[PDB]
């Protein structure tokens, strides 16, 4: 075996060559915070939330993209790693809108959860925020683009898994908008899964819009019957009424997606 030896917080772990720093931390049971990294999408590296300190190296590295070298001691809990996480979270929350009560992603928001876990507890942003025009990409995906953190999971999903190539980024800088640039309707057969991978309430489910909330939902693991694929799903109910259908991960069937009919 050509396994090399790397260290995560001093603990030795043997990894295949070409392993990213995030996967080396994942082998010892530690999850690095991330927003643009998705294990079934291509590596973008454009949110900088995964920046971790390699010791004896005066620069944090993007753990979602950086391959490990032999003998790196990855410091997941060191001081400049935590300062990197807090700074990146503060920039993510600077122009982000105060919509958490009126947002469907609340209670199941990655931005909320790892703001609580890895960021500071207050604001230094003494300016006015941006507001982005909402797009119309279909009767399934509600679009509130002020909540977008520009992580490009949209675009990588629609390009690589749905094979659509119609989502994209227009503009430059703080005015970079994720959309289709035209009045175009994103209707694939897998067009609902962008609601799953969007870590914020920028893309939400329009049938599930405003109706429930994830802490009060009972998660019943079940099977799809709409096709013969047998896609493993979660039926989430609330007070004896079906609220939504999410995917379960099964590596051999539906990897973590479902079709729009199933959803």
């Amino acid at each position: 075996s050509n396994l090399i030896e790397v260290f995560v917080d001093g603990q030795s772990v043997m990894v295949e060559p070409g392993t990213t720093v995030l996967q080396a931390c994942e082998k010892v049971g530690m999850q690095i915070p991330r927003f643009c990294y998705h294990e079934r999408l291509s590596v973008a590296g454009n949110c900088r939330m995964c920046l971790v300190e390699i010791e004896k190296a005066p620069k944090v590295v993007a753990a979602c993209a950086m391959p490990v070298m032999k003998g790196w001691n990855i410091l997941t809990n060191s001081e400049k790693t935590k300062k990197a996480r807090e700074g990146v979270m503060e920039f993510l929350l600077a122009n982000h809108p105060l919509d958490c009560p009126i947002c469907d992603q609340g209670g199941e928001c990655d931005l909320q959860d790892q703001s609580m876990m890895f960021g500071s507890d207050r604001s230094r942003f003494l300016e006015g925020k941006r507001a982005v025009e909402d797009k119309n990409i279909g009767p399934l995906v509600k679009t509130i683009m002020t909540r977008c953190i520009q992580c490009t999971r949209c675009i990588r999903f629609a390009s690589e898994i749905a094979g659509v190539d119609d989502l994209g980024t227009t503009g430059r800088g703080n005015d970079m908008q994720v959309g289709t640039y035209i009045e175009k309707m994103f209707m694939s057969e897998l067009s609902g899964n962008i609601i799953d991978i969007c870590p914020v309430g920028a893309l939400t489910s329009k049938p599930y819009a405003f109706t429930a909330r994830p802490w009060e939902t009972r998660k019943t693991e079940s099977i799809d019957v709409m096709d013969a694929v047998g896609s493993n799903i979660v039926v989430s109910t609330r007070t004896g009424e079906v609220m939504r259908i999410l995917p379960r991960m099964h590596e051999d069937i539906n990897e973590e997606w479902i079709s729009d009919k199933t959803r």
Partner: protein
Amino acid sequence: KTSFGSLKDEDRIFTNLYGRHDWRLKGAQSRGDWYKTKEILLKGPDWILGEVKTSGLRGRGGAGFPTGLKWSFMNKPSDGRPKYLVVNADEGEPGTCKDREIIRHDPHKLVEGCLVGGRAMGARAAYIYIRGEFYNEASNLQVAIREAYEAGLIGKNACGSGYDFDVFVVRGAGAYICGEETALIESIEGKQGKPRLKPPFPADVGVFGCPTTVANVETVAVSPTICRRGGAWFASFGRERNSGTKLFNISGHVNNPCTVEEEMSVPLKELIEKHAGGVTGGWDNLLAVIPGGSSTPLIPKSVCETVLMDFDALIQAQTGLGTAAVIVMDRSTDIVKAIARLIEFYKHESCGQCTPCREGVDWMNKVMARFVRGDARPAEIDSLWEISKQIEGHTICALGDGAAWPVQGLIRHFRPELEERMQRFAQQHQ
């Protein structure tokens, strides 16, 4: 040598820097260009890489990486993929207009540099990513490339050496971030000019997926002069690890803003008062100097009296050399208005890819726009410092660093002027 500067005209690389001679082929061959190019090409890649390593040439793009060490990343066997030299002719740095002068006035020097450098790195072609705003310079360069093909100097059997080498010119379309080498690669490939992450370095995965070296116009154009005159000739100028000659663009509040080729470790005061006629209103009228274009931290008058204009003495002066573009600012300057305009430039020229630049450069522009009016309190100065330290080092490319450093230089050298601006705002609006 101990004191540096006062470069002689016989020791110049960029003869016809001023457009005073014929830039075409019969003028260029009458000035030493395209002379014994075949004898440079036939001596192999290792000899040319050794002459560039001997010369001590560092990257003239602005970061100053050792050019021979950078170009020896391509001295590796073919893996089926072609290899590409890519000339970075964007030059979007405020203050910097030297590559415009090389392309406009010494284009055959750049074409011979493409040939010699791509021979050193085994490259197949040269993509000169020129700035889109430099249209006349691009057609100027294309006329020179046509003259180089019709003389058989490039193309099929370039200079009679049995080496095939093309030279292409790709025009930009108005993005400062497309001078960053990976974003320039992404712009040649027909996409948005967003920088790639490193690694893979462009020598591994570069333009089109190929082994690729992106190098500045100056560090490519001086390479046939290094091969002809010898590496030790080029290493005999400037301090140690600061070798060679350098183009300087002295603009702003000087009497005669100009481009000048000067020896490397020249003093800043000597360069200004010798080639630019000095600061307007005298040297006592000097307030600040941005030494190397917009990305470097500024230095005040008490640093500009003694500082040398190379990489290392400006790093020790807690700034950088950069593009050696000297922006001089006199005592009549609202320096907060100039630095806030510079941060406004960096939020207009920022590709929006990663979080700290996309959000924090706009947030620094809003804070600097309030600091111009003084519509703030002094605890927001240190806070702004922290914002810069959260942008610096955490971004994908160095435009976040280049946006953080003017803020940090302005705070570090002019915190009392910011505080008096804000307290006089407070006492005239309350």
